[PDB]
Amino acid sequence: PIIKGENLAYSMDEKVDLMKGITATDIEDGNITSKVQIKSSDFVEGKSGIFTVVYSVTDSDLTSECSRTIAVTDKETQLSDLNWKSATIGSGSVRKDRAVSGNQIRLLNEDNSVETFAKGIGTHSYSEIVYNSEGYDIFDTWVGIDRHVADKKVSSVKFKVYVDGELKAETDVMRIDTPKKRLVVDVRNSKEIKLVVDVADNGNNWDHADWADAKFRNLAEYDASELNKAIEEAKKLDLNNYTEESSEALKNAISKGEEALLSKDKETINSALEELNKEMNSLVKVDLNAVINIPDKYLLKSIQNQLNKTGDITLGDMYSLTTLTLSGVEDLTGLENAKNLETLNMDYNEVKDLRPLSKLKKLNTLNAQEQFIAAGELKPSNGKVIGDSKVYNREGKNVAKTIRVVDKNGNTILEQDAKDEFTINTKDLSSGLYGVHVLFEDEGFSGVMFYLFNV
Ligand SMILES: [Ca+2]
Numbered sequence: 001p002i003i004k005g006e007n008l009a010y011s012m013d014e015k016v017d018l019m020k021g022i023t024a025t026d027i028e029d030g031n032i033t034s035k036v037q038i039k040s041s042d043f044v045e046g047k048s049g050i051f052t053v054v055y056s057v058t059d060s061d062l063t064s065e066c067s068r069t070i071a072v073t074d075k076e077t078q079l080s081d082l083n084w085k086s087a088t089i090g091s092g093s094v095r096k097d098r099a100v101s102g103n104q105i106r107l108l109n110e111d112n113s114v115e116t117f118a119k120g121i122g123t124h125s126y127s128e129i130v131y132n133s134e135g136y137d138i139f140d141t142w143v144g145i146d147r148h149v150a151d152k153k154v155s156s157v158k159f160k161v162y163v164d165g166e167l168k169a170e171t172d173v174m175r176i177d178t179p180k181k182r183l184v185v186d187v188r189n190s191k192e193i194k195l196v197v198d199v200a201d202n203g204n205n206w207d208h209a210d211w212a213d214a215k216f217r218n219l220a221e222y223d224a225s226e227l228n229k230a231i232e233e234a235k236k237l238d239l240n241n242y243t244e245e246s247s248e249a250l251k252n253a254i255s256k257g258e259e260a261l262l263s264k265d266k267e268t269i270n271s272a273l274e275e276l277n278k279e280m281n282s283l284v285k286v287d288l289n290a291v292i293n294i295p296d297k298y299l300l301k302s303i304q305n306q307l308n309k310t311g312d313i314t315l316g317d318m319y320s321l322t323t324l325t326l327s328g329v330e331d332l333t334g335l336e337n338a339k340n341l342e343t344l345n346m347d348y349n350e351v352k353d354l355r356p357l358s359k360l361k362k363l364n365t366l367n368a369q370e371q372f373i374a375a376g377e378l379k380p381s382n383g384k385v386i387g388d389s390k391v392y393n394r395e396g397k398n399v400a401k402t403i404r405v406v407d408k409n410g411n412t413i414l415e416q417d418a419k420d421e422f423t424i425n426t427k428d429l430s431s432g433l434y435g436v437h438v439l440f441e442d443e444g445f446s447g448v449m450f451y452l453f454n455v
Contacts, residue, residue, distance in 0.1 A: 001026040001064035003036065003057055007169075007184040009071045009140045012048065012220055012264065016070065024057045024064070032057055039065065046228060048072045048220035050138070050186060071138045071184065073217035074264070078119045079141075080214070085130045085192070087123075090204040094129065095122040099146045105210045106147035107180040114147055115180060117212040122146065125157045125207035127197040133163070133190045133216070141195075141214035143171060144180035145207075152176070152206035159209070161185045162194035173200040180212065187216070222266035227273045231257045234280060244339065246284045253279040288316030296331035330373070332356040343367075350374070352449055354394045366394075371447025378436070378453040383427040385453045390420045391440040400449075402439035408432050429455050 003024045010016050018041070024032045040054035050071040056063055080096040092100045099105050099122035107115050120142075123129060133139070143159040153176070160170040161183055171181045187193055197209040234254050239247040253276040260272035291312040294300040303313050306324055318337035326346035335341070336356045343365035344357070352373040357363055378385045390398045400418035407413055407430075414424070418438065436451035 001029075001032065001057055001059050001062055003055055003064045003066040005055055005066045005068040006182065007069050007071075007186075009073060009138055009184045009217055011076075012072065012074050016043070016045065016072065018043065018053055018070070021068075022055055022066075024055075026059045026062075028061055029059045032059055035059075043070065044225075046225050047223065048074060050188075050219075069184075069186065071186075071217065072219075073138055074220035074222075075218045076140075077136070077216045077218075078214070079131055079211065079216070080119050080121055082131060085132060087129045088127055089124050090126045090199070090207065091124045094127070098122050099148055099210060100124045100208050101146070101148040103146075103148050105212050107142060107144035107210060107212050108147065108177065110179045112179075115142075115212070117142070117210070119215070120213055121195070121211040123195075123197055123209055123211070125197040125199045125204045125209060127195075127209070129195045129211075131193050131195070133187045133193040135218075136190075136216040137186070137188050137219050138217035139183070139185040139187045139193055139214075140217050141183050142180045142210075142212035143174070143183060144178065144210060144212065145174055145176050146210050149206040149208045150176055154202040155206045155208065156200035156202060157207050157209045158198040158200050159183065159211075160196040160198060162196060163187050163190050164192055165194070220264070222264060222269055224261050224264075224269055227257055227260060227269045227276070230273055230276050230280070231261075234276060237283075241285055242283050243286055246279075246282060250276075250279045250283060286315060288314060288319065290315050292318055292334050292337050294334040296329055296333065298328040299326065299331065299334060302326045302329060326351075336360070348372075352447075353392045354445060355392050355396055358394045358396065363394075366444045368445045369447070371445075373447065373449040375438075375449050375451050378451050380426045380453055380455065383425070385424045385426050387422055387424075387436060387438075387451050388420070389418050389422050389438045389449065391438065391447075391449060393442045393445055399442040399445065400438055400440045402437075404437050404439070406435045406437060408434070424453075426453070426455055431455050 005022045022036055024036050026032055036055055036057045039056040043051040050069055052069050054067045056065045087094045097119055105117040105120040105122055109115050145155045149155045155176050156173055158171055158173050161168050169183050169185050195211055231254060257272040257276045260269045307317055315337055319340055321338040321341050323343040326349050330350045332351055333356055341360050342362045345367045347367045347369050349371055350373050351371055378387045389400050389403060391400045393399050403418045403422045404415040405413050405424060432455055434453055438449035
Protein backbone atom coordinates (compact mmCIF):
# COMPACT_ATOMS: atom_id res chain seq x y z
CA PRO A 1 0.00 0.00 0.00
CA ILE A 2 1.42 3.35 -1.16
CA ILE A 3 -0.46 6.18 0.57
CA LYS A 4 0.42 9.62 -0.79
CA GLY A 5 -0.45 13.18 0.18
CA GLU A 6 1.07 16.62 -0.38
CA ASN A 7 0.85 19.87 1.55
CA LEU A 8 -2.21 22.00 0.77
CA ALA A 9 -3.26 25.61 1.30
CA TYR A 10 -6.78 27.07 1.44
CA SER A 11 -8.21 30.56 1.74
CA MET A 12 -10.67 31.77 4.36
CA ASP A 13 -13.81 31.41 2.21
CA GLU A 14 -12.94 28.06 0.60
CA LYS A 15 -14.42 24.74 1.70
CA VAL A 16 -11.65 22.56 3.12
CA ASP A 17 -11.64 19.01 1.72
CA LEU A 18 -9.49 16.97 4.10
CA MET A 19 -9.19 14.20 1.49
CA LYS A 20 -8.11 16.44 -1.40
CA GLY A 21 -4.99 15.01 -3.02
CA ILE A 22 -4.92 11.80 -0.96
CA THR A 23 -4.29 8.62 -2.95
CA ALA A 24 -3.68 5.01 -1.95
CA THR A 25 -2.57 2.26 -4.34
CA ASP A 26 -1.54 -1.34 -3.73
CA ILE A 27 -0.31 -4.11 -6.02
CA GLU A 28 -2.53 -6.68 -4.30
CA ASP A 29 -5.71 -4.56 -4.13
CA GLY A 30 -5.42 -1.78 -6.70
CA ASN A 31 -6.96 1.64 -6.04
CA ILE A 32 -7.94 1.56 -2.36
CA THR A 33 -8.42 5.33 -2.11
CA SER A 34 -12.04 4.88 -1.00
CA LYS A 35 -10.86 3.03 2.14
CA VAL A 36 -8.56 5.82 3.38
CA GLN A 37 -9.28 6.87 6.96
CA ILE A 38 -7.95 9.70 9.13
CA LYS A 39 -5.73 8.56 11.99
CA SER A 40 -4.84 11.94 13.54
CA SER A 41 -5.76 15.58 12.97
CA ASP A 42 -5.80 18.90 14.84
CA PHE A 43 -7.97 20.61 12.23
CA VAL A 44 -10.70 23.08 13.24
CA GLU A 45 -13.22 24.45 10.76
CA GLY A 46 -13.62 28.21 10.45
CA LYS A 47 -10.14 28.78 11.88
CA SER A 48 -7.00 30.14 10.24
CA GLY A 49 -3.89 28.07 10.83
CA ILE A 50 -1.63 25.26 9.67
CA PHE A 51 -3.10 21.89 10.66
CA THR A 52 -1.57 18.41 10.51
CA VAL A 53 -3.57 15.40 9.27
CA VAL A 54 -2.41 11.77 9.26
CA TYR A 55 -3.94 9.24 6.86
CA SER A 56 -4.02 5.44 7.14
CA VAL A 57 -5.50 2.69 4.98
CA THR A 58 -5.88 -1.09 5.26
CA ASP A 59 -5.86 -3.47 2.29
CA SER A 60 -7.44 -6.89 1.71
CA ASP A 61 -4.56 -9.10 2.88
CA LEU A 62 -1.35 -4.48 5.83
CA THR A 63 -1.55 -0.77 6.66
CA SER A 64 0.40 2.27 5.49
CA GLU A 65 0.51 5.82 6.85
CA CYS A 66 1.30 9.28 5.53
CA SER A 67 1.08 12.83 6.85
CA ARG A 68 0.51 16.26 5.31
CA THR A 69 -0.30 19.78 6.47
CA ILE A 70 -3.29 21.91 5.46
CA ALA A 71 -2.99 25.69 5.83
CA VAL A 72 -5.96 28.08 5.96
CA THR A 73 -4.70 31.55 5.04
CA ASP A 74 -6.07 35.00 4.25
CA LYS A 75 -3.91 37.80 2.84
CA GLU A 76 -1.66 36.90 -0.09
CA THR A 77 1.33 38.67 -1.63
CA GLN A 78 2.62 37.79 -5.08
CA LEU A 79 6.38 37.35 -5.25
CA SER A 80 6.38 39.21 -8.57
CA ASP A 81 4.84 42.14 -6.67
CA LEU A 82 7.97 42.19 -4.46
CA ASN A 83 11.68 42.69 -5.08
CA TRP A 84 14.06 39.75 -4.78
CA LYS A 85 17.26 40.09 -2.78
CA SER A 86 19.22 38.32 -5.53
CA ALA A 87 18.56 36.39 -8.72
CA THR A 88 20.73 34.12 -10.87
CA ILE A 89 19.69 32.56 -14.17
CA GLY A 90 21.44 30.19 -16.56
CA SER A 91 20.21 31.89 -19.74
CA GLY A 92 18.35 35.11 -20.42
CA SER A 93 17.04 37.25 -17.57
CA VAL A 94 14.46 36.66 -14.85
CA ARG A 95 11.10 38.20 -15.76
CA LYS A 96 8.23 39.26 -13.50
CA ASP A 97 4.75 38.07 -14.55
CA ARG A 98 6.19 36.80 -17.86
CA ALA A 99 8.09 33.74 -19.00
CA VAL A 100 11.81 33.99 -19.70
CA SER A 101 11.02 34.19 -23.42
CA GLY A 102 8.81 37.24 -22.84
CA ASN A 103 5.59 35.34 -23.54
CA GLN A 104 2.89 34.74 -20.95
CA ILE A 105 3.56 32.25 -18.16
CA ARG A 106 2.08 28.99 -19.45
CA LEU A 107 2.15 25.52 -17.88
CA LEU A 108 0.54 22.16 -18.62
CA ASN A 109 -2.53 20.90 -16.77
CA GLU A 110 -3.41 17.33 -15.83
CA ASP A 111 -5.92 17.11 -18.71
CA ASN A 112 -3.19 18.25 -21.18
CA SER A 113 -4.73 21.72 -21.48
CA VAL A 114 -2.52 24.79 -21.05
CA GLU A 115 -2.87 27.00 -17.97
CA THR A 116 -2.03 30.66 -18.58
CA PHE A 117 -0.97 32.71 -15.54
CA ALA A 118 -0.93 36.48 -15.19
CA LYS A 119 1.39 36.37 -12.17
CA GLY A 120 4.58 34.48 -11.44
CA ILE A 121 8.32 34.36 -12.06
CA GLY A 122 9.80 33.18 -15.34
CA THR A 123 13.37 31.95 -15.02
CA HIS A 124 15.83 29.47 -16.54
CA SER A 125 18.04 26.78 -15.03
CA TYR A 126 20.34 27.02 -13.38
CA SER A 127 18.57 29.63 -11.25
CA GLU A 128 18.68 30.80 -7.63
CA ILE A 129 16.22 33.53 -6.59
CA VAL A 130 16.17 34.73 -2.97
CA TYR A 131 13.33 36.69 -1.37
CA ASN A 132 12.84 38.31 2.02
CA SER A 133 10.40 36.00 3.82
CA GLU A 134 10.18 37.82 7.17
CA GLY A 135 6.65 37.97 8.56
CA TYR A 136 5.20 35.44 6.09
CA ASP A 137 3.66 32.07 6.97
CA ILE A 138 3.12 30.00 3.80
CA PHE A 139 4.76 29.93 0.37
CA ASP A 140 2.52 28.62 -2.43
CA THR A 141 3.39 28.19 -6.10
CA TRP A 142 2.84 26.21 -9.28
CA VAL A 143 5.94 24.93 -11.08
CA GLY A 144 6.62 23.39 -14.46
CA ILE A 145 8.27 23.73 -17.84
CA ASP A 146 7.12 26.81 -19.74
CA ARG A 147 5.04 25.98 -22.80
CA HIS A 148 7.23 28.08 -25.12
CA VAL A 149 9.68 25.15 -25.39
CA ALA A 150 6.99 22.54 -26.05
CA ASP A 151 8.85 21.53 -29.24
CA LYS A 152 12.37 21.34 -27.75
CA LYS A 153 12.17 17.68 -26.60
CA VAL A 154 15.02 17.87 -24.07
CA SER A 155 13.57 20.35 -21.55
CA SER A 156 13.96 19.08 -17.98
CA VAL A 157 14.33 20.79 -14.58
CA LYS A 158 13.84 20.18 -10.87
CA PHE A 159 12.32 22.77 -8.54
CA LYS A 160 13.65 23.15 -5.00
CA VAL A 161 12.64 25.50 -2.18
CA TYR A 162 15.11 26.42 0.57
CA VAL A 163 14.04 28.14 3.79
CA ASP A 164 16.94 29.86 5.56
CA GLY A 165 19.31 27.63 3.61
CA GLU A 166 17.45 24.42 4.49
CA LEU A 167 15.81 22.36 1.75
CA LYS A 168 12.11 22.04 2.59
CA ALA A 169 10.42 20.86 -0.62
CA GLU A 170 11.28 19.68 -4.12
CA THR A 171 9.72 18.07 -7.17
CA ASP A 172 10.85 15.19 -9.34
CA VAL A 173 12.51 15.81 -12.69
CA MET A 174 9.87 17.72 -14.65
CA ARG A 175 9.76 17.40 -18.44
CA ILE A 176 7.75 19.05 -21.22
CA ASP A 177 4.73 16.75 -20.82
CA THR A 178 4.84 16.75 -17.00
CA PRO A 179 1.68 18.46 -15.66
CA LYS A 180 2.25 21.40 -13.34
CA LYS A 181 3.05 20.61 -9.71
CA ARG A 182 2.10 22.55 -6.58
CA LEU A 183 4.49 23.41 -3.75
CA VAL A 184 3.16 24.64 -0.39
CA VAL A 185 5.99 25.39 2.04
CA ASP A 186 5.90 26.48 5.68
CA VAL A 187 8.06 29.61 5.95
CA ARG A 188 7.01 30.64 9.46
CA ASN A 189 9.57 32.69 11.42
CA SER A 190 12.04 32.67 8.52
CA LYS A 191 14.16 35.41 6.97
CA GLU A 192 14.97 34.10 3.48
CA ILE A 193 13.42 31.75 0.93
CA LYS A 194 15.51 30.51 -2.00
CA LEU A 195 13.80 29.28 -5.18
CA VAL A 196 16.09 26.88 -7.06
CA VAL A 197 15.64 25.47 -10.57
CA ASP A 198 18.20 22.72 -11.17
CA VAL A 199 19.22 21.43 -14.58
CA ALA A 200 18.26 17.70 -14.27
CA ASP A 201 19.58 15.99 -17.44
CA ASN A 202 20.80 17.42 -20.76
CA GLY A 203 22.27 20.41 -18.96
CA ASN A 204 20.21 23.60 -19.01
CA ASN A 205 19.21 23.26 -22.67
CA TRP A 206 15.77 24.83 -23.23
CA ASP A 207 15.12 24.78 -19.47
CA HIS A 208 12.41 27.44 -19.39
CA ALA A 209 10.89 27.19 -15.91
CA ASP A 210 8.07 29.12 -14.24
CA TRP A 211 7.22 29.81 -10.61
CA ALA A 212 3.58 30.28 -11.57
CA ASP A 213 1.32 32.18 -9.15
CA ALA A 214 4.18 32.13 -6.62
CA LYS A 215 2.91 34.00 -3.57
CA PHE A 216 3.17 34.29 0.18
CA ARG A 217 0.12 33.44 2.28
CA ASN A 218 -0.47 34.67 5.82
CA LEU A 219 -2.77 33.44 8.56
CA ALA A 220 -5.82 35.61 9.13
CA GLU A 221 -5.49 38.59 11.46
CA TYR A 222 -9.04 37.92 12.71
CA ASP A 223 -11.04 35.04 14.18
CA ALA A 224 -14.78 34.65 13.62
CA SER A 225 -15.23 31.46 15.67
CA GLU A 226 -16.44 33.22 18.82
CA LEU A 227 -18.82 35.50 16.93
CA ASN A 228 -20.11 32.54 14.91
CA LYS A 229 -20.71 30.67 18.17
CA ALA A 230 -22.70 33.53 19.72
CA ILE A 231 -24.79 34.06 16.57
CA GLU A 232 -25.77 30.40 16.23
CA GLU A 233 -26.83 30.25 19.88
CA ALA A 234 -28.72 33.53 19.49
CA LYS A 235 -30.55 32.31 16.37
CA LYS A 236 -31.78 29.32 18.42
CA LEU A 237 -33.96 31.57 20.61
CA ASP A 238 -37.66 32.20 20.01
CA LEU A 239 -38.15 35.95 19.60
CA ASN A 240 -41.87 35.60 20.37
CA ASN A 241 -41.05 34.76 24.02
CA TYR A 242 -39.48 38.20 24.60
CA THR A 243 -40.79 41.75 24.50
CA GLU A 244 -40.88 43.50 21.14
CA GLU A 245 -38.34 46.06 22.39
CA SER A 246 -35.80 43.51 23.62
CA SER A 247 -36.34 41.08 20.73
CA GLU A 248 -35.79 43.96 18.29
CA ALA A 249 -32.44 44.79 19.90
CA LEU A 250 -31.27 41.17 19.80
CA LYS A 251 -32.46 40.86 16.20
CA ASN A 252 -30.47 43.98 15.30
CA ALA A 253 -27.39 42.59 17.07
CA ILE A 254 -27.67 39.30 15.17
CA SER A 255 -27.80 41.28 11.92
CA LYS A 256 -24.79 43.39 12.93
CA GLY A 257 -22.95 40.18 13.77
CA GLU A 258 -23.74 38.68 10.37
CA GLU A 259 -22.40 41.84 8.72
CA ALA A 260 -19.24 41.61 10.83
CA LEU A 261 -18.60 38.06 9.60
CA LEU A 262 -18.55 39.28 5.99
CA SER A 263 -16.26 42.20 6.84
CA LYS A 264 -13.43 39.82 7.86
CA ASP A 265 -12.26 42.68 10.10
CA LYS A 266 -10.98 41.89 13.59
CA GLU A 267 -12.36 44.92 15.43
CA THR A 268 -15.68 44.86 13.57
CA ILE A 269 -16.15 41.24 14.64
CA ASN A 270 -15.09 41.89 18.25
CA SER A 271 -17.39 44.91 18.54
CA ALA A 272 -20.35 42.98 17.13
CA LEU A 273 -19.63 40.11 19.54
CA GLU A 274 -19.61 42.42 22.57
CA GLU A 275 -22.88 44.03 21.47
CA LEU A 276 -24.50 40.66 20.75
CA ASN A 277 -23.48 39.40 24.19
CA LYS A 278 -24.94 42.56 25.75
CA GLU A 279 -28.33 42.14 24.07
CA MET A 280 -28.23 38.41 24.88
CA ASN A 281 -28.13 39.18 28.62
CA SER A 282 -30.57 42.10 28.22
CA LEU A 283 -33.44 39.90 27.02
CA VAL A 284 -36.63 40.17 29.08
CA LYS A 285 -39.29 37.47 28.80
CA VAL A 286 -42.96 38.32 28.27
CA ASP A 287 -45.65 37.46 30.84
CA LEU A 288 -48.66 35.97 29.04
CA ASN A 289 -50.54 36.06 32.37
CA ALA A 290 -50.16 39.77 33.17
CA VAL A 291 -53.42 41.72 33.12
CA ILE A 292 -53.83 44.40 30.44
CA ASN A 293 -55.33 47.73 31.53
CA ILE A 294 -58.43 48.31 29.38
CA PRO A 295 -60.18 51.49 30.61
CA ASP A 296 -63.00 51.28 28.04
CA LYS A 297 -65.48 48.76 29.43
CA TYR A 298 -66.98 48.28 25.96
CA LEU A 299 -63.59 47.30 24.53
CA LEU A 300 -63.19 44.85 27.42
CA LYS A 301 -66.62 43.39 26.64
CA SER A 302 -65.79 43.29 22.92
CA ILE A 303 -62.60 41.31 23.55
CA GLN A 304 -64.41 39.00 25.99
CA ASN A 305 -67.05 38.27 23.35
CA GLN A 306 -64.40 37.40 20.76
CA LEU A 307 -62.36 35.17 23.10
CA ASN A 308 -65.21 33.65 25.15
CA LYS A 309 -64.07 34.38 28.71
CA THR A 310 -64.82 36.57 31.72
CA GLY A 311 -62.64 38.65 34.00
CA ASP A 312 -59.24 40.08 33.15
CA ILE A 313 -57.79 40.02 29.64
CA THR A 314 -54.16 38.90 29.61
CA LEU A 315 -51.29 39.61 27.24
CA GLY A 316 -51.55 35.98 26.16
CA ASP A 317 -55.19 36.73 25.41
CA MET A 318 -54.12 39.84 23.47
CA TYR A 319 -51.49 37.90 21.50
CA SER A 320 -54.23 35.50 20.35
CA LEU A 321 -56.37 38.09 18.53
CA THR A 322 -56.16 37.71 14.77
CA THR A 323 -59.59 39.27 14.18
CA LEU A 324 -61.68 41.50 16.43
CA THR A 325 -65.12 43.11 16.20
CA LEU A 326 -65.89 46.18 18.32
CA SER A 327 -69.17 47.74 19.42
CA GLY A 328 -69.71 50.93 21.40
CA VAL A 329 -65.99 51.50 21.97
CA GLU A 330 -64.67 55.00 22.69
CA ASP A 331 -61.06 54.30 23.73
CA LEU A 332 -58.78 51.81 21.97
CA THR A 333 -56.29 51.82 24.87
CA GLY A 334 -54.97 48.29 25.41
CA LEU A 335 -55.22 47.15 21.79
CA GLU A 336 -51.54 48.03 21.33
CA ASN A 337 -50.78 44.63 22.90
CA ALA A 338 -52.50 42.56 20.16
CA LYS A 339 -49.43 42.37 17.95
CA ASN A 340 -50.99 39.60 15.82
CA LEU A 341 -54.19 41.53 15.03
CA GLU A 342 -54.96 41.32 11.31
CA THR A 343 -58.56 42.57 11.04
CA LEU A 344 -60.41 45.15 13.15
CA ASN A 345 -64.14 45.59 12.46
CA MET A 346 -65.13 48.75 14.36
CA ASP A 347 -67.66 50.38 12.06
CA TYR A 348 -70.36 52.51 13.71
CA ASN A 349 -68.29 52.88 16.89
CA GLU A 350 -67.31 56.00 18.88
CA VAL A 351 -63.54 56.19 18.33
CA LYS A 352 -61.69 59.41 17.46
CA ASP A 353 -58.09 58.21 17.91
CA LEU A 354 -56.50 55.30 16.02
CA ARG A 355 -53.02 55.89 17.49
CA PRO A 356 -53.13 52.80 19.80
CA LEU A 357 -53.11 50.74 16.57
CA SER A 358 -50.09 52.57 15.12
CA LYS A 359 -47.53 49.83 15.85
CA LEU A 360 -49.74 46.90 14.77
CA LYS A 361 -47.69 45.49 11.89
CA LYS A 362 -50.32 43.00 10.65
CA LEU A 363 -53.46 45.20 10.73
CA ASN A 364 -54.24 45.15 7.00
CA THR A 365 -58.06 45.24 7.30
CA LEU A 366 -59.35 48.24 9.27
CA ASN A 367 -63.10 48.90 9.09
CA ALA A 368 -63.62 52.10 11.11
CA GLN A 369 -66.20 53.93 9.01
CA GLU A 370 -69.08 56.14 10.19
CA GLN A 371 -68.03 56.78 13.77
CA PHE A 372 -69.94 59.07 16.13
CA ILE A 373 -68.09 60.66 19.06
CA ALA A 374 -70.39 62.62 21.38
CA ALA A 375 -67.76 65.06 22.66
CA GLY A 376 -70.05 66.72 25.20
CA GLU A 377 -70.94 70.34 25.85
CA LEU A 378 -68.85 73.45 25.18
CA LYS A 379 -69.40 76.43 27.48
CA PRO A 380 -69.41 79.85 25.76
CA SER A 381 -66.94 82.30 27.29
CA ASN A 382 -65.81 85.79 26.24
CA GLY A 383 -68.49 85.89 23.56
CA LYS A 384 -67.13 82.80 21.80
CA VAL A 385 -67.09 79.02 22.08
CA ILE A 386 -63.90 77.01 21.52
CA GLY A 387 -63.65 73.29 20.86
CA ASP A 388 -61.11 70.66 19.91
CA SER A 389 -61.39 69.16 16.42
CA LYS A 390 -58.39 66.85 16.01
CA VAL A 391 -59.22 63.29 14.94
CA TYR A 392 -56.12 61.09 14.79
CA ASN A 393 -55.54 58.27 12.33
CA ARG A 394 -52.99 55.49 12.85
CA GLU A 395 -50.16 57.77 11.70
CA GLY A 396 -51.12 60.40 14.28
CA LYS A 397 -52.38 62.82 11.62
CA ASN A 398 -55.46 64.99 12.07
CA VAL A 399 -57.99 63.87 9.44
CA ALA A 400 -60.76 66.34 10.33
CA LYS A 401 -62.43 67.77 7.22
CA THR A 402 -65.55 69.94 7.68
CA ILE A 403 -66.57 72.06 10.67
CA ARG A 404 -70.25 72.99 10.41
CA VAL A 405 -72.55 74.47 13.06
CA VAL A 406 -76.25 73.60 13.11
CA ASP A 407 -79.15 75.29 14.88
CA LYS A 408 -82.27 73.71 16.39
CA ASN A 409 -84.01 73.72 12.98
CA GLY A 410 -81.26 71.89 11.08
CA ASN A 411 -80.05 74.91 9.10
CA THR A 412 -76.28 75.23 8.68
CA ILE A 413 -75.38 78.59 10.22
CA LEU A 414 -71.70 78.40 9.18
CA GLU A 415 -69.15 76.02 7.67
CA GLN A 416 -65.37 76.20 7.32
CA ASP A 417 -62.21 74.12 6.98
CA ALA A 418 -61.18 71.93 9.90
CA LYS A 419 -58.00 72.67 11.83
CA ASP A 420 -56.78 71.43 15.21
CA GLU A 421 -59.25 73.72 17.03
CA PHE A 422 -62.25 75.85 16.10
CA THR A 423 -63.58 79.13 17.49
CA ILE A 424 -67.23 80.09 16.97
CA ASN A 425 -68.59 83.59 17.51
CA THR A 426 -71.70 83.45 19.70
CA LYS A 427 -72.46 87.14 20.32
CA ASP A 428 -74.69 87.37 17.22
CA LEU A 429 -76.44 84.03 17.80
CA SER A 430 -80.07 83.73 18.82
CA SER A 431 -80.83 82.03 22.13
CA GLY A 432 -81.15 78.27 21.84
CA LEU A 433 -79.32 74.98 21.45
CA TYR A 434 -76.67 74.52 18.77
CA GLY A 435 -74.70 71.53 17.53
CA VAL A 436 -71.17 71.36 16.14
CA HIS A 437 -70.38 68.62 13.62
CA VAL A 438 -66.71 67.77 13.06
CA LEU A 439 -66.69 65.82 9.80
CA PHE A 440 -63.64 63.65 9.14
CA GLU A 441 -62.66 61.01 6.61
CA ASP A 442 -59.60 58.90 5.81
CA GLU A 443 -58.63 55.50 4.41
CA GLY A 444 -61.24 53.34 6.13
CA PHE A 445 -61.68 55.87 8.97
CA SER A 446 -64.63 58.26 8.88
CA GLY A 447 -67.36 59.60 11.13
CA VAL A 448 -68.69 62.61 13.02
CA MET A 449 -67.43 64.27 16.21
CA PHE A 450 -70.36 66.14 17.75
CA TYR A 451 -70.35 69.07 20.18
CA LEU A 452 -73.13 71.23 21.57
CA PHE A 453 -73.32 74.67 23.17
CA ASN A 454 -76.30 76.53 24.62
CA VAL A 455 -76.94 80.23 24.08
CA1 LIG B 1 17.67 20.16 -18.32
